[PDB]
Design an enzyme around this catalytic site. Structure first.
Site, PDB file in Angstrom:
ATOM      1  N   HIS A   1       0.827  -1.216   0.000  1.00  0.00           N
ATOM      2  CA  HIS A   1       0.000   0.000   0.000  1.00  0.00           C
ATOM      3  C   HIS A   1       0.859   1.262   0.000  1.00  0.00           C
ATOM      4  O   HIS A   1       0.627   2.199  -0.774  1.00  0.00           O
ATOM      5  CB  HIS A   1      -0.905  -0.006   1.236  1.00  0.00           C
ATOM      6  N   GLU A   2       1.852   1.295   0.879  1.00  0.00           N
ATOM      7  CA  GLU A   2       2.653   2.502   1.058  1.00  0.00           C
ATOM      8  C   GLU A   2       3.529   2.755  -0.167  1.00  0.00           C
ATOM      9  O   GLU A   2       3.698   3.900  -0.591  1.00  0.00           O
ATOM     10  CB  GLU A   2       3.510   2.415   2.319  1.00  0.00           C
TER      11      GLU A   2
ATOM     12  N   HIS B   1       1.728   4.535  -2.768  1.00  0.00           N
ATOM     13  CA  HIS B   1       1.816   5.974  -2.566  1.00  0.00           C
ATOM     14  C   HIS B   1       3.187   6.515  -2.983  1.00  0.00           C
ATOM     15  O   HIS B   1       3.287   7.586  -3.597  1.00  0.00           O
ATOM     16  CB  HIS B   1       1.585   6.345  -1.087  1.00  0.00           C
TER      17      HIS B   1
ATOM     18  N   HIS C   1      -5.488   6.978  -2.900  1.00  0.00           N
ATOM     19  CA  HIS C   1      -6.406   5.933  -2.449  1.00  0.00           C
ATOM     20  C   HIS C   1      -7.421   5.550  -3.505  1.00  0.00           C
ATOM     21  O   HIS C   1      -7.778   6.349  -4.362  1.00  0.00           O
ATOM     22  CB  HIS C   1      -7.107   6.339  -1.150  1.00  0.00           C
TER      23      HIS C   1
HETATM   24  N1  LIG Z   1      -9.566  -0.696  10.154  1.00  0.00           N
HETATM   25  C1  LIG Z   1      -8.648   0.391  10.405  1.00  0.00           C
HETATM   26  O1  LIG Z   1      -9.033   1.508  10.255  1.00  0.00           O
HETATM   27  C2  LIG Z   1      -7.166   0.091  10.636  1.00  0.00           C
HETATM   28  C3  LIG Z   1      -6.819  -0.515  12.006  1.00  0.00           C
HETATM   29  C4  LIG Z   1      -7.766  -0.251  13.177  1.00  0.00           C
HETATM   30  C5  LIG Z   1      -7.159   0.002  14.566  1.00  0.00           C
HETATM   31  O2  LIG Z   1      -6.607  -0.894  15.127  1.00  0.00           O
HETATM   32  O3  LIG Z   1      -7.505   1.171  15.264  1.00  0.00           O
HETATM   33  N2  LIG Z   1      -6.369   1.268  10.371  1.00  0.00           N
HETATM   34  C6  LIG Z   1      -6.105   1.519   8.971  1.00  0.00           C
HETATM   35  O4  LIG Z   1      -6.655   0.859   8.141  1.00  0.00           O
HETATM   36  C7  LIG Z   1      -5.488   2.867   8.600  1.00  0.00           C
HETATM   37  C8  LIG Z   1      -6.611   3.895   8.760  1.00  0.00           C
HETATM   38  C9  LIG Z   1      -6.284   5.372   8.911  1.00  0.00           C
HETATM   39  C10 LIG Z   1      -7.593   6.120   9.050  1.00  0.00           C
HETATM   40  O5  LIG Z   1      -8.196   6.082  10.262  1.00  0.00           O
HETATM   41  O6  LIG Z   1      -8.135   6.635   8.019  1.00  0.00           O
HETATM   42  N3  LIG Z   1      -5.039   2.789   7.209  1.00  0.00           N
HETATM   43  C11 LIG Z   1      -3.666   3.166   6.900  1.00  0.00           C
HETATM   44  O7  LIG Z   1      -2.862   3.328   7.762  1.00  0.00           O
HETATM   45  C12 LIG Z   1      -3.210   2.951   5.460  1.00  0.00           C
HETATM   46  C13 LIG Z   1      -2.105   1.908   5.401  1.00  0.00           C
HETATM   47  C14 LIG Z   1      -2.447   0.524   4.833  1.00  0.00           C
HETATM   48  C15 LIG Z   1      -3.693   0.075   4.108  1.00  0.00           C
HETATM   49  C16 LIG Z   1      -3.437  -1.271   3.743  1.00  0.00           C
HETATM   50  C17 LIG Z   1      -4.307  -2.235   2.964  1.00  0.00           C
HETATM   51  C18 LIG Z   1      -3.900  -3.680   3.023  1.00  0.00           C
HETATM   52  C19 LIG Z   1      -4.666  -4.621   2.306  1.00  0.00           C
HETATM   53  C20 LIG Z   1      -5.767  -4.163   1.527  1.00  0.00           C
HETATM   54  C21 LIG Z   1      -6.647  -5.199   0.831  1.00  0.00           C
HETATM   55  C22 LIG Z   1      -7.434  -4.869  -0.235  1.00  0.00           C
HETATM   56  C23 LIG Z   1      -8.308  -5.856  -0.784  1.00  0.00           C
HETATM   57  C24 LIG Z   1      -8.409  -7.158  -0.173  1.00  0.00           C
HETATM   58  C25 LIG Z   1      -7.649  -7.459   0.989  1.00  0.00           C
HETATM   59 CL1  LIG Z   1      -7.764  -9.043   1.814  1.00  0.00          CL
HETATM   60  C26 LIG Z   1      -6.815  -6.509   1.517  1.00  0.00           C
HETATM   61  C27 LIG Z   1      -6.148  -2.760   1.470  1.00  0.00           C
HETATM   62  C28 LIG Z   1      -5.377  -1.772   2.195  1.00  0.00           C
HETATM   63  N4  LIG Z   1      -2.163  -1.672   4.195  1.00  0.00           N
HETATM   64  O8  LIG Z   1      -1.575  -0.515   4.880  1.00  0.00           O
HETATM   65 ZN   LIG Z   2      -2.811   5.148   2.146  1.00  0.00          ZN
END
Ligand SMILES: NC(=O)[C@H](CCC(=O)O)NC(=O)[C@H](CCC(=O)O)NC(=O)CCc1cc(-c2ccc(-c3cccc(Cl)c3)cc2)no1
Ligand SMILES: [Zn+2]
Ligand SMILES: [Ca+2]
Ligand SMILES: [Ca+2]
Ligand SMILES: [Ca+2]
Ligand SMILES: [Zn+2]
Length: 159
Positions: free
Chosen positions: A114-115, A118, A124
């Site tokens: 993902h990174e 970018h 996105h």
């Molecule tokens: N669900 C969440 O929001 C999680 C973790 C939750 C937590 O523990 O608080 N955090 C994050 O997701 C943060 C959110 C930042 C925000 O709040 O906007 N995102 C960031 O930090 C972006 C970084 C990021 C996104 C991804 C990703 C990996 C796999 C897919 C994928 C696609 C299709 C199929 C499959 Cl199976 C997988 C899509 C994206 N990897 O690193």
């Molecule tokens: Zn991102």
């Protein structure tokens, strides 16, 4: 079209290593993440240990010297700058996460895919199938595939 690297040979350097994983596992995840993007573009990526590295890979916590402070465990997992000199292209990973080779904690490989997207100029995607979708979700590396949207995006920048 936003910024893109105006060369097809791009270097990266791993600035530092998370203690969460073995060093060889960090190297491997980062290498495989770059390979995901080189597999579908003319780009080539080589790891170097000093010098003019285009993409610096960094693990850091909280406020760490740019205007994109981290937020402790959870929330933001990583962030990266688009193509450009200096901090441009650099990819930062939140050390307050627990980085893994697997499904526990946060999978470094997928986050790196993902990174790096970018770092190469992708924004996105609103398509939930795409690795560039905003929210992380786990899938095994052996099953992972870039989506058609991801490939459309990166080929629109580099062909
Ligand atoms: N669900 C969440 O929001 C999680 C973790 C939750 C937590 O523990 O608080 N955090 C994050 O997701 C943060 C959110 C930042 C925000 O709040 O906007 N995102 C960031 O930090 C972006 C970084 C990021 C996104 C991804 C990703 C990996 C796999 C897919 C994928 C696609 C299709 C199929 C499959 Cl199976 C997988 C899509 C994206 N990897 O690193
Ligand atoms: Zn991102
Ligand atoms: Ca850079
Ligand atoms: Ca975080
Ligand atoms: Ca950690
Ligand atoms: Zn940063």
């Amino acid at each position: 079209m936003g910024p893109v690297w105006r060369k097809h040979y791009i270097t990266y350097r791993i600035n530092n290593y998370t203690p969460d994983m073995n060093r060889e596992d960090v190297d491997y995840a980062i290498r495989k993440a770059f390979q995901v993007w080189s597999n579908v573009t003319p780009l080539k990526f080589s790891k170097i240990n000093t010098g003019m590295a285009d993409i610096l890979v960094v693990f850091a916590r909280g406020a760490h010297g740019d205007d994109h402070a981290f937020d402790g465990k959870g929330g933001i997992l990583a962030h990266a700058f688009g193509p450009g000199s200096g901090i441009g292209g650099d990819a930062h990973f939140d050390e307050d996460e627990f980085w893994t080779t697997h499904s526990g904690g946060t999978n470094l490989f997928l986050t790196a895919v993902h990174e790096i997207g970018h770092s190469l100029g992708l924004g996105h995607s609103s398509d939930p199938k795409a690795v560039m979708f905003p929210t992380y979700k786990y899938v095994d590396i052996n099953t992972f595939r870039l989506s058609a949207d991801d490939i459309r995006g990166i080929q629109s920048l580099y062909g």
